[PDB]
Structures are given as C-alpha cells and as structure tokens.
Amino acid sequence: PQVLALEVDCNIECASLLDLYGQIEVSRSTFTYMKIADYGQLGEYTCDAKCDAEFGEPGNIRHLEGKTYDYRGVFCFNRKNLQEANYDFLSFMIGAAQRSHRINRNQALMIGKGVNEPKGWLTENCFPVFQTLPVDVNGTSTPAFLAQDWRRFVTSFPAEYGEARSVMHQNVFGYLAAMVDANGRFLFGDGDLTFTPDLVRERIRISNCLPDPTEGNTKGGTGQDAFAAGSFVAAQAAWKTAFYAVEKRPMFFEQYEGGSSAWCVKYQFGAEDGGFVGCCEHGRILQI
Amino acid sequence: MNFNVGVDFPSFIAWDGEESFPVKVDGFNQFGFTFKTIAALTAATTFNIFYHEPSDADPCVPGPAIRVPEVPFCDTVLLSEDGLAAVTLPETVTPDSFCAGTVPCMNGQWISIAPATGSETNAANVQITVTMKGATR
C-alpha cells in the first residue's frame, strides 16, 4: 500500500515523414490547380528556298483537383469507475487518440489505399522502382544487396531535378554500416568500432516504420535469411515537390449533449486533412 | 458494481478432488489457499506440499515435485518428523465453510498440493484452489 509516482509506458513512435512533403493549407474541402504536361515539338529547321512554314504537335494540359478526408471517433462512458478517482482516464483517451491520429495519418500518407484516403505514394507504383542485381554464390544466384549498389542508386538520380533526399529504416543503415570487405575490414568507414556520420550531410532521413526489408535484423541472408526478393529497400525523392500534404482542421473534441443521460457522458471528436502526390518522377525506390 | 477482480487475485484450480495442478507463482509474490468441502467428512485428512523448478527441457514448464520443508515460526510446539511442510484438514468441517492457509516460505517456480497417502478417499470430497496478489511483470 505504498503507490509510487512512476508511469513507465514503453510505446514507440514513428518518424515524421510530413515535413519533407509540400505542406499546404486550405479552408474548403475541395481544391484544384493547373498542370503543364509536355510543351511538345513546335517546328523544325525549315530548309532553304521556302518562304512557307510548318505544323506539328503541341502538348496537353490538365487542370486537376483533389479533396480532403475525415477521421472521427466517438467515445462514451458511464461515470463510476471514472469521475470518482483513480486517474483522469479521459486524458488518457485524449492522448491515445492524438497519438493514433498521428500514426495512422503517417501510415496512410505512406500507404493510403485510394478510396477515401490520400493515395499512398508507395502503392501508387508510379514512382520508378529499381530492383537490385542477383548475386551468384556457391552455384546459387541468391538475391542480396551490395555496397556499390546503394551508391549506384543514390548517384543515379537525375542531378538537374534538384536536391533529392533519401529515406530508409535504421535496420537498413545498420546493415549498411556493417558492410565487410574481402579483407575482413569494415568495408565502409572503418577503424572506430562503429560508424556514425551525420546523416544530414549524407542527405538521409531515417525512419523506423518504413517497410524495413531487414526485419529486426533477422532478415539478412546467406541461404535462409536471404534479403528476400522485391522488398522495399529504401527511397529517394525531392519531397518538396514529390508529395504534398493539405491540412484543413486539426483534431477537435466536444461533449455530445443528448444521449448523455448523466451517467453515459458521450464525447465526440475528429479531424480533417489529406494528401496527394505531385508528378511521381522526382524520386525512385530501391527494391530487391 | 463488482470490479473486474480477476485482473488481480487470479484463481487457479489446485486440487479438483482427484487431480493436482502445478501453478506458477513467479509473477506473484503472495499467494494463499482456499479449501472447500463438497460432502460430509469421515476422518481428518492430510496433504503434502510440493514445488517445481523450470524443467531443463523447457523454461516455461514445471519440473519434478520436490517436497516443501516446513519453516518454524516462533512459539512452535511440534515439527513434522521429516521436517517437510504439510497441511491437514480436521474432521467435522461441514461443506459450507471455506478454509484458508498460507506457507510463509516460497521456493521453486510452481506450487502443488497432493493428498497425503491413506487420507485420499475423503480427498475426493475436498476442493483446493489458490489466489495470488502480485503481477511484477
């Protein structure tokens, strides 16, 4: 009978893959905009001795549009393993709701399946995907990832687009910093028992709920751990123009008068926002 | 307004008349005993306490049944000739009167009770179960 004041939780958060996207605000629930498809051929070096001229093929144009989406929870009560006194379980539910909202919003904007959701740029499959090269070993072409590949992926981006950062799981970076050469040396940065370069200079933002092709470091591979075919390894894009997140109204909470019969206090809440993709060309995805 | 008094003090069958059941108290620090009768008794009955260790084959199953040694309090007048702990239900206990008990010395990871030999016919009319106090994990 000596209750303490510690409230150990042990629950994890994701990374915030939102500040990279193009943040936009609007009051109305439906927006629209313009697009320049492809200027197109509009002539040729007219040959000599011809005061005439020529025709050809111009480029299309598309005024596009999008909507927002909702996310609302009711959560009632009864008020006597409640209001009496152990803890303000209400605040617990409020915090859990906000955390759930953030995590589900991030998961949606990453993998949102079309209907009533911001179409997840992963499942869109219109970002270019670069499968990796198979690896022969003891007469077996077992899929596997190899240092140069990563570099070849990060350098293969069209430079004239602009600065394109990259995204990956901490498991992938751990597998990467643990690359060992034929000389048993630590293939990458080597000779400090570790490898801690500031990823901001190395233009890499890290996450922990990305598809993690190196599942809890268990999935590596020589013959059974094999990194497994086609598995999102990482991605790279200029997210200031690749994706966009539109914000309409934050979470709101209010008591629902009516239905509440002085014991079942019924609270109502919710939020509205959405997202979409730009042209899914400024950015690619490294897969097995 | 009965609370969910099973998410603490969880009870488990220990002796259903003709079968014992090793119960894990590792998560708990405190555990009592509840004895109940179902019919009329004939003579007094005796029970021997056992405890079990994590089997080398599996760290989540009970091992063998090691007898529990009796720890004496102050002001003790008799000790079991073996020095091993044991309980006994006296005669003339009508089957609407629960009985409580507790050994103050835990050892092992599983506990168990068995009807001491020669006093096992009446054991059929005896029911034993145990509740706990702890979680710790």
Binding site: D136, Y175, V180, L187, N217, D225 | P59
Partner: peptide
C-alpha cells in the same frame, strides 16, 4: 457485457538470430 480480458503469465522468449552482411564475392 462481460468482455473477458487477458494478460500473459509467462512466455518462451527465444533468441532472435543475428545475420550481418556476408562478404561480397564479386558481380561477375
């Protein structure tokens, strides 16, 4: 109504393996 709730008493936490980059032979 009665939503009978659960928790674990014990478990058998195994040892997750730990595979790390095998050496690369060479492409070709």
């Amino acid at each position: 109504m009665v939503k009978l709730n659960c928790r674990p008493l014990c478990q058998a936490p195994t040892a997750s393996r730990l595979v790390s980059p095998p050496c690369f032979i060479c492409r070709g």
